[PDB]
Design a protein around this ligand. Structure first.
Ligand code: HEC
Ligand code: HEC
Lengths: 144, 144
């Protein structure tokens, strides 16, 4: 498997098979993103158990560069895979970063992100803004 | 159970638990979309067996109106759920519409779309542009 993140978090195996929580696009990143979760995170998302999210929930955000469909040029679609971002809920273990273990792996090569074991402070620079929602921006997409 | 589509196709049960094939955004629709598939479709997508897609593959496209995150205005995120669009592969049964059974259900109330049993001719009006790719536009997103 890929190397662990600098804070010791291992890449969750088989995350590409996880169920969908939502999707997004960031104007400044020129990307498309999928937000998936493990079974605990998906149950929590669906039942609104996000105040706080329960221990063991793992969220993944997958990002691709925007590209356009040759046969349909107004369709913005995934190009190159850029990264997999994770948040692992463990209120006690990760109390210093809002109860979440942050980790990122870059590209198809799955290179662990971060200069040192303190790298998650970057993530917290933005995710602190979402403190009222237990540090999670994503609102689970509505489905029947 | 939601009413069947005008061509007799029943709403696939449990589609929200299906694995991710990709995501998209249509500039003219002001939306965000997820593309999921049943496990027949997902295996085909991952192995590149999409010439043609195997019988029994079901693709679903879920659409939400774009909305912006209150805490991060440049993050385009799902608002209202607009529709679930399906293609069910059955080369023999749906030979008249490219080997796919098309069907759409609207909104959280899951109202079947289509004026009459011939509604899928609309879908074909665009999807015929993709005939050389077995009537499917989506290129499965790349993941490691
Ligand atoms: C999305 C994210 C997710 C999904 C959970 C969530 O909080 O919605 C993960 C697992 C993750 N990020 Fe964070 N991120 C930001 C925003 C606004 C969103 C929601 C909109 C969207 O889908 O794009 C996020 C913002 C930021 C940010 C501000 C510039 C930074 C610096 C980060 N994110 C950093 C990180 C991480 C540090 C390595 C990390 C593991 C993240 N994000 C995980
Ligand atoms: C996406 C779609 C999917 C996913 C499979 C695929 O072909 O990619 C389904 C199940 C579906 N649609 Fe079709 N559709 C169009 C385009 C360009 C894309 C790819 C880009 C994206 O993700 O947005 C599609 C185009 C059109 C179109 C041209 C204006 C029409 C009229 C339709 N689509 C119509 C239908 C349906 C008729 C009711 C139907 C069941 C569809 N699409 C299913």
């Amino acid at each position: 498997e890929p190397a662990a993140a600098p804070n010791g978090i291992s890449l969750p195996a088989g995350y590409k098979d996880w169920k969908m929580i939502g999707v997004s696009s960031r104007i400044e990143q020129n990307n498309l993103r999928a937000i998936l979760g493990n079974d605990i995170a998906v149950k929590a998302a669906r039942e609104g158990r996000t105040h706080p999210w329960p221990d063991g929930a793992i969220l993944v955000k997958l990002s691709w560069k925007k590209s356009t469909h040759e046969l349909f040029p107004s369709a913005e679609v995934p190009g190159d895979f850029t990264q997999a971002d994770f948040m692992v809920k463990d209120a006690a273990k990760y109390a210093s970063t809002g109860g979440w273990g942050y980790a990122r792996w870059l590209g198809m090569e799955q290179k662990p992100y971060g200069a040192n074991a303190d790298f998650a402070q970057e993530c917290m620079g933005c995710h602190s803004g979402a403190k009222a929602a237990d540090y999670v921006f994503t609102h689970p997409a509505k489905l029947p």
